[model samples]
Target: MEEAKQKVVDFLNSKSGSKSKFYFNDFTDLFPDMKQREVKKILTALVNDEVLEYWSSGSTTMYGLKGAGKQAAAE
Candidate 1:
């Protein structure tokens, strides 16, 4: 009976700068009372909206707020 979109954003903001990126498991921990799949979907929705973005370090993948840690140099 709760919407976690804002809650997730708040958590991300709290972890900004020093720890802006996170693993899927990190978000799941914030909603222990909810199912893992549910949290995954929420994260998916956020990414879809461009509020969050995906970053990959080759073999590893992580999530972070859009433009938070990005350093893309456009050509």
Candidate 2:
């Protein structure tokens, strides 16, 4: 579990940095061979850590690295 979570953190870090906003549905292929259920868990954990900030008002949720000039702060 730790390994998988860390892998996600690394992927988010590599792709998101401090500017890019990530759409959850877009990375559905992130775990090609595994189930997709865990991805949201990983993202929620990161949001708890404030490692990222997210926007989820409509049907879809989005994420980006936590930092300056943003929407609501991570919870």
Candidate 3:
């Protein structure tokens, strides 16, 4: 749902307010009532919708709001 998506976005852009990139597992902690797989599905949808973007580090991948991190500084 868009509601959960908004919360995730807000968590990254507002609540967290410190880290730019976050692990895939980080988002799972937001909704304790939801299963980890469910959170993954939501995050995948957010990425597809361009509300979030992925940052791969060869060994693992991180996530962040699009245009809000180092990418923003480069612009």
Candidate 4:
């Protein structure tokens, strides 16, 4: 579980400091081996842990790291 959490953090970091408003489809495209259900689980875990904020605008749900401006702030 720790490894999975770390992988989620790594995925967030790898976006070249881009904001996390990514589409679910885009996440699947980036991690083709991962099922959408698994992705959703990981994302929900992060949000529950206060590591991220999830929101939906119409049909698209977006995610963004929480507590900007510090390393490990999201954790």
Candidate 2: deviation at residue 71, Å?
Answer: 11
Q: What is the clash count for each candidate, in the order shown? A: 0, 0, 0, 0
CA-lDDT, candidates in order: 0.76, 0.66, 0.79, 0.71
> Which 10-residue span in candidate 2 carries the lowest summed lDDT?
66-75
**Candidate 1: deviation at residue 4, Å?**
0.3
Question: lDDT of model 1 at residue 32?
Answer: 94
Model 1, 1-75: lDDT tens digits are 136988888887773354667888778877899798888888888989999887775575578788767533331
The digit string of per-residue lDDT tens for model 4 on 3-72 reads 7657666677664756646666766676678878998888888989888777786887877667543443
For candidate 1, what is the lDDT? 0.76
lDDT of 2 at 14: 65
Scored by lDDT, model 2 comes in at 0.66
- Model 2: lDDT of residue 34: 53
Using alpha carbons, what is the TM-score of model 4?
Answer: 0.69
At residue 62, candidate 1 shows an lDDT of 73
Question: Candidate 2 regions off by >4 Å?
Answer: 15-19, 68-75
Residue 16 displacement (Å), model 2? 9.5
> What is candidate 3's lDDT per residue for 46-74, written digit by digit as tens?
98988888888667667889876766577
Residue 24 of model 1: what lDDT? 80
Error (Å) of candidate 3 at residue 71 is 3.4
Best by lDDT: 3
TM for every model, in the order presented, reads 0.75, 0.65, 0.76, 0.69
